């Protein structure tokens with residue numbers, strides 16, 4: 001109805017996503033005490049390069065992982081805008097990047113405590129793909145729900161407020177959410193804090209703990225996003 005945030009990703013093929021709306025990561029996060037695939041020489045990089053994040057000219061954002069030399073590159077977009085409790089947030093996404101080493105995600109983040117991982121897929125061959133509600137930044141308090149991810153188009157929707165968070169895949173009117181978490185489930189539930197707001201993140205990383213080894217994978221690896229809408 002009345003959207004408080006939206007991008008329909010319109011624009012010519014090969015053009016940049018809207019840089020006034022999205023912060024495109026210029027480097028992968030530096031990691032204290034890295035695991036094997038988080039080491040600086042093995043982890044996937046992020047950059048603001050049209051080879052890794054571009055509009056397709058048909059109304060989709062493409063976030064793309066590529067290999068150049070011995071280095072893999074992906075991309076991460078984070079909204080400048082932030083929204084608080086009581087909204088519904090949805091993206092329509094097609095994951096064509098479900099390959100060894102890849103680690104796509106659609107999530108709501110904060111620099112403070114808490115995170116809503118709406119859909120995450122792990123190319124490490126070890127971890128189930130999942131939707132996760134995190135109460136703490138240390139990753140020490142959460143509720144998670146395993147989901148299965150195919151390569152078809154889906155909508156991924158969350159609604160969250162002070163009292164809980166709910167998730168739907170391919171929402172239709174009256175559908176029961178596939179996963180719901182109430183405030184009572186997490187002692188350190190942060191989402192009821194006054195003024196608490198979250199930004200939208202869409203990203204495709206390579207390697208790190210979630211992706212691990214990209215050898216033998218299919219690159220370029222593509223994550224397509226038709227829109228993000230919040231109301």
Ligand SMILES: [Ca+2]
Pocket residue numbers: 008009010058059060225226227
């Ligand atoms: Ca679109």
